[PDB]
Amino acid sequence: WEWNVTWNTSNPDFTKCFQNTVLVWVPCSYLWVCFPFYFLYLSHHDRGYIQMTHLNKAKTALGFLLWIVCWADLFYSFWLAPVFLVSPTLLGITMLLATFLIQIERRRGVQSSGIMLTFWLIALLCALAILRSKIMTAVFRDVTFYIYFSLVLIQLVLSCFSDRSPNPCPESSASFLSRITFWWITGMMVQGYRQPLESTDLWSLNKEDTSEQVVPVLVKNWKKECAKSPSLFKVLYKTFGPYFLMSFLFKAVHDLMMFAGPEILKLLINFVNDKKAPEWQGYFYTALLFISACLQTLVLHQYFHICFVSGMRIKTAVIGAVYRKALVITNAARKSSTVGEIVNLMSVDAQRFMDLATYINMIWSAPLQVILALYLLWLNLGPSVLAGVAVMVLMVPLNAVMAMKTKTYQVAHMKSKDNRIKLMNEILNGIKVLKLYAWELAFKDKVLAIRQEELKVLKKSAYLAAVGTFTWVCTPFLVALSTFAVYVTVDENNILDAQKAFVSLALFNILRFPLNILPMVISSIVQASVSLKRLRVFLSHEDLDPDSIQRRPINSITVKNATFTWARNDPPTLHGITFSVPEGSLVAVVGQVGCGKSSLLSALLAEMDKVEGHVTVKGSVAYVPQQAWIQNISLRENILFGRQLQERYYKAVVEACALLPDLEILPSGDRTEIGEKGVNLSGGQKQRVSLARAVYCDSDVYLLDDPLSAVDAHVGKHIFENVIGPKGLLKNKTRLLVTHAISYLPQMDVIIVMSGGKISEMGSYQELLARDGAFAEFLRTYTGQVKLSVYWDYMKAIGLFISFLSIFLFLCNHVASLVSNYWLSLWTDDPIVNGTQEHTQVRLSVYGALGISQGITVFGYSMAVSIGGIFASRRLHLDLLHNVLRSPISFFERTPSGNLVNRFSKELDTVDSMIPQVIKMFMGSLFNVIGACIIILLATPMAAVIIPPLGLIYFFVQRFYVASSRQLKRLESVSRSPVYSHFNETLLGVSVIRAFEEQERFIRQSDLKVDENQKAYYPSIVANRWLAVRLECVGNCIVLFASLFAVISRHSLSAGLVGLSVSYSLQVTTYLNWLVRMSSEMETNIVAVERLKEYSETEKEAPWQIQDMAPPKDWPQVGRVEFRDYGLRYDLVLKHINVTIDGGEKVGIVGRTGAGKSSLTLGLFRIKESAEGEIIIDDINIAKIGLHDLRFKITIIPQDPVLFSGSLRMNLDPFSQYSDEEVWTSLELAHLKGFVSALPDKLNHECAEGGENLSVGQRQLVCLARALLRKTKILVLDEAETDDLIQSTIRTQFDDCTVLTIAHRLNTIMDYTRVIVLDKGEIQEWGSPSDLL
Ligand SMILES: CC[C@]1(O)C[C@@H]2CN(CCc3c([nH]c4ccccc34)[C@@](C(=O)OC)(c3cc4c(cc3OC)N(C=O)[C@H]3[C@@](O)(C(=O)OC)[C@H](OC(C)=O)[C@]5(CC)C=CCN6CC[C@]43[C@@H]65)C2)C1
Ligand SMILES: CC[C@]1(O)C[C@@H]2CN(CCc3c([nH]c4ccccc34)[C@@](C(=O)OC)(c3cc4c(cc3OC)N(C=O)[C@H]3[C@@](O)(C(=O)OC)[C@H](OC(C)=O)[C@]5(CC)C=CCN6CC[C@]43[C@@H]65)C2)C1
Ligand SMILES: N[C@@H](CCC(=O)N[C@@H](CS)C(=O)NCC(=O)O)C(=O)O
DSSP: OOHIIIIISSSOOOOHHHHHHHHHHHHHHHHHHHHHHHHHHHHHSOOOOOOOOHHHHHHHHHHHHHHHHHHHHHHHHHOOOTHHHHHHHHHHHHHHHHHHHHHHHHHTTOSSOHHHHHHHHHHHHHHHHHHHHHHHHOOOSHHHHHHHHHHHHHHHHHHHSOOOOOOOOTTTTOOHHHHHTTOTTHHHHHHHHHSOOOTTTSOOOOTTTSHHHHHHHHHHHHHHHHHOOOOHHHHHHHHTHHHHHHHHHHHHHHHHHHHHHHHHHHHHHHHHHOTTSOHHHHHHHHHHHHHHHHHHHHHHHHHHHHHHHHHHHHHHHHHHHHHHHHHHBOHHHHHHHTTHHHHHIIIIIHHHHHHHHHHTTHHHHHHHHHHHHHHHHHHHHGGGHHHHHHHHHHHHHHHHHHHHHHHHHHHHHHHHHHHHHHHHHHHHTTHHHHHHTTOHHHHHHHHHHHHHHHHHHHHHHHHHHHHHHHHHHHHHHHHHHHHHHHHHHHOTTOOOOHHHHHHHHHHHHHHHHHHHHHHHHHHHHHHHHHHHHHHHHHHTSOBOOGGGBOOBOOOOEEEEEEEEESSSSSOOSEEEEEEEEOTTOEEEEEOOTTSSHHHHHHHHTTOSEEEEEEEOOBSOEEEEOSSOOOOSSBHHHHHHSSOOOOHHHHHHHHHHTTOHHHHHHSTTGGGSBBSSSSBOOOHHHHHHHHHHHHHHHTOSEEEEESTTSSSOHHHHHHHIIIIISTTSSOSSSEEEEEOOOSTTGGGOSEEEEBSSSBBOOOBOHHHHHHHTSHHHHHHHHOOOOOOHHHHHHHHHHHOHHHHHHHHHHHHHHHHHHHHHHHHHHHHHTOOOBTTBOSOSHHHHHHHHHHHHHHHHHHHHHHHHHHHHHHHHHHHHHHHHHHHHHHSOHHHHHHSOHHHHHHHHTTHHHIIIIIHHHHHHHHHHHHHHHHHHHHHHHHHOGGGGSSHHHHHHHHHHHHHHHHHHHHHHHHHHHHHHHHHHHHHHHHHHSHHHHHHTTOHHHHHHHHHHHHHHHHHHHHHHHHHHHHHHHHHHHHHHHHHHHHHHHHHHTGGGSOHHHHHHHHHHHHHHHHHHHHHHHHHHHHHHHHHHHHHHTGGGSSOOOSOSOOSSSOOOSSSSSSOOEEEEEEEEEOOEEEEEEEEEEOTTOOEEEEEOTTSSHHHHHHHHTTSSOOSBOOOEETTEETTTSOHHHHHHHEEEEOSSOOOOSBOHHHHHOTTOOSOHHHHHHHHHHTTOHHHHTTSTTGGGOOBOTTSSSSOHHHHHHHHHHHHHHHOOSEEEEEOOOOHHHHHHHHHHTTTSSEEEEEOSOHHHHTTSSSEEEESSSSEEEEEOHHHHO
16 A cells, blocks of 8 residues: 555556555454444344245355355466455455345345345445556456456346335345435325325334333333332333444434534535645545435434434323323322323423433434544644634523523513413403403403413513524634634744645534524423423333222122222221112212211222222223213214213214204204313213213213213212112112202102211111101202415514515625635635735734625624514404404304414414524525535536426425425424323213223324324424435535536636535535425425415404594483384294384284394394394384494393403403493492492402303492492393392483393383293284283
């Protein structure tokens, strides 16, 4: 090895000894170090054995022949040089290891072998180098090498094809090349462009990615850890750590390869410096740069794939284990953890684990990258690098402090947003009463105040985000300027050549990311630490005793000397209970409140903690809980409960529970979506469903914990007759019922009466009555791409001046960056005379000036984008609120309240906290690309020939990525919510699930939902990897072309220009993809703006204030109402209405369901526009008057009074227009002075959502107080205990005012003269009740 023939000569030939030693030791050596390690994977991971195919044999036969040929050399050598013995033997032996390896790979079922392929690629390159040398030298030993090379080439070609296998995910069947360069998802991207993607188009999860695979492994490892009485981290890295080990390896390789880049750039700069260097050296350097960049791309995205897959495995396993634990944990643990905390364990903790696994390897990669970059910068610049290190040491803690303060601001913003969302939910749930009361402006002002607090904290967060963008963008320049200034100023002979400038710039750009992610990674580790503590606490919770009850398959229920607890430390709730319930007997638990009736049924289900005794419940148990648990599935599936539908049995169960009227009122019948999310049901209906579900399940033992609490007396008696009674559906079933109603007690076979959780003289009804003891005492007790129009809409919401100022500032920022780097290039070209550079302080001053301009302009554009985002969020929230409050009631009835809430929640978030940062990221990911391309084209104009082709590539790739990514993302977005929702359901009805033994069915359902979520999430991240690989190699193909054109025209190019072009190309690589990912984020984020502005063109209500035809104060002077040919369409509910209500004349409206009674009040308040009608109050038409005016001059007491959160005074007078004396007088006149004076907060009593603290009677009297305080001449009443009080109060002082009354009860309407009867909208009778009869 000497430099004359290998590097100095125009023919780069390797020496003969080098050829025969190192070029042969490289490939053989690769297989020798990998072979042992590869058994780990081959053994731990198995997939069967592949059959005998021609391909596998072809490879094995060529491996045999190749070994022979290599040993044939040893034979000829045996037939002087020491290398002519060891090298052929070694090659033969490693070849024998290669053929054995494909053999064992066949045995272990691997279709594509990364090792064999790479190994053959390295062998091929080594053979190619020797081949070229041997063909340039020119029989004896050469022909053996030609045979070796041809066989190696054919072996390499064979190794690319995938062998036979031993809507699935194509990742498995994918070849090694298809796996490293993600190609099995190309079909998904093309399909997503051509057709919309649905959940039916998504591939089935990998068998190792499925919940049924990952969750049991974690559960087993947790069981092992808990048996060794517990570290959840130990379990986590014992279960997923093995798989994550490869990411660590890939992470290291990427770090080394990414530092190779600046070294090769240094070599290229040195090559351009000397004009006597052979050109092949420059082509070798650019090939090395291209190869290292492409390798770094591959290993990096393989590392990312491993990290993301491991994060999935962790999230799925954690979710499954949490679900199973919740299915097994005891009542004390559930009481400790509430409900939202457990769902938080299922959502935020598992998501934190996944997001952490994405970047946790940085906790070591970032320090190692920093150390390596600092050492290379030292090698370049001496001790002058300490200035840049000092700048970094200043900036990184600054970034951490700003991140902590941003977290504080986000906590405050979340609190204020939750307040706003609560207020908006109460506004939407009660918008009818708001519009009827003309209260839209007051609640608008309330929401605006909450949003003002939210916008203040958002503005502070925006200031912080702008400073953070400034620091992140301008820290590389600060480091470069500090190190360059110190370098040139400490020593006059410190020459700043291109080698010491642009290589150092590349090193600073390498340093930029790790420094910025290290604080974030440490914060993520701390958050994952607290989340891991929460998960470990939940998974260490006490498990319920499964055998607490004997659960004997088919004296039916046996309890002897059994005492139960609700907690180990807590005293017993049921002391010394004994009773035997025979098969097919009706037993009623009897007691007072807090006696221990429900505790008995909980104890029979192994929900109580049994401190002593023996319970032997025989056969299946159907539990009807006191608090009805309703699944969000349809009512039919609620009753079925995952059971085969039997039409006769179902249709016998539904009416026996008297569920037929409930089915009739509900829109879709039994297919209606009952539950919290769907249609809400009354308590009695929920008890009916629960009882119907229990009856359909057809158990032998029934535990009915007060099934008839909320059903009415007639409905309850009917239910008992057809279901629970001896002549009902459950005649032969053992029914244990908890009741406090005597009506059905004589029909009960056995009455278990207890007191204070103790058995107290149980027996039959007649015998217990005869005994005259405790029972007698008890009885005596009583699509396409988002349009540019919405981008322009967001730009206008920001403000055209702010948006265009930010665009100008960003353009100035990158112009300054480009000019600063060009100035550095000119600086590096400064000649050396007398050992120094003449122009240093001028160059340094201009570099610093350009950097200061860049910094102030970066701060400027970050400020402009951040502030414009605040402005846009304010404008969009105001417009959305105004449009919502102006839209008619029909709009709220039509549109589900879910999407209306999803406009003020999430969508505002996307607009205010996400869109500005995505805009900032896109601007950079775009102008970094533009500046790099401009620099490359200006330095090497010929590089314009590769801009079109690669650009075309970019186009197509971007297209497919975008056209699929959003779809995948939206699929992911629709899959995450059900899982937690399901968990919530499982947390609410865990007692029901345990009693019905449906734990496995719900575990499978949770596995399904998670698997659907992961089936949406996996294609998304693999899409990210696909886009990256393609466009990063595209950017790396440019790096190649930029360096190649630099070496082609090196004689007319300076070293500074070459270094500049190559450095800028090195980074355009890390951005062409981020440019697309950010374009996709823009497309998927601007839709939020589109959904915010969608109620802007819908039909709105008539103007609230006309101000041209406004009425005079006291417009209803007497309140003379006249319906002149009124017609209202909800075809016409109201028709031919010609009635006249005189001023101060009491008038009521009677009619059956389906008449226009209520719709008539909607006519008075103009809720629905008059299809044909001229309602006139006194001498003024209603339709001409603005809405607010009439809504203020007419008052209405609706069916269910809606009390809004806040003080009582804000309920009575939201505008605070009426004085305190008027409020006090009205409250006293409303029979409420005694109660209202009782609250410690006086008039400022904080009533919760809907006035839950207040009683129904009180809320009704508060609504009456509102109407009384209004002091208007026209009042409407909507009637459904306190009825005597509200009726007397409406009859007390409102005799002066004209009162319309719609009552479903004839008793009250009889008092009012002039009754109007509505048959089907027509006026059936118009006269006084005396003329009625
Ligand atoms: C409110 C502060 C905030 O939270 C910080 C910051 C940005 N957040 C929004 C959240 C977010 C981040 N990534 C995302 C990718 C897609 C969608 C959202 C995000 C990011 C993150 O990873 O969070 C975990 C992040 C971003 C960049 C970043 C380092 C960084 O995390 C340490 N880089 C600086 O170090 C920039 C970058 O150019 C770089 O590193 O250049 C050397 C980076 O490109 C590469 C090759 O990585 C990237 C990535 C999108 C590409 C385009 C240009 N832009 C500029 C910023 C940068 C980014 C968190 C907001
Ligand atoms: C694959 C799709 C996508 O890439 C995922 C997801 C969103 N992306 C858009 C890219 C993006 C992200 N951040 C940004 C910040 C500015 C500009 C762009 C982005 C984010 C990211 O940082 O990527 C690296 C991200 C976002 C949120 C997120 C977790 C998350 O990534 C870990 N949340 C969970 O923590 C949400 C959040 O509300 C929350 O805490 O919810 C309980 C979160 O609030 C906090 C305190 O963090 C935040 C952050 C801005 C606040 C406002 C409301 N929104 C809702 C989503 C959330 C975010 C990437 C699209
Ligand atoms: N050079 C960086 C590259 C990491 C990188 O690409 N940056 C972020 C993006 S901010 C990332 O990890 N991307 C993951 C993704 O594709 O979501 C390293 O040291 O790994």
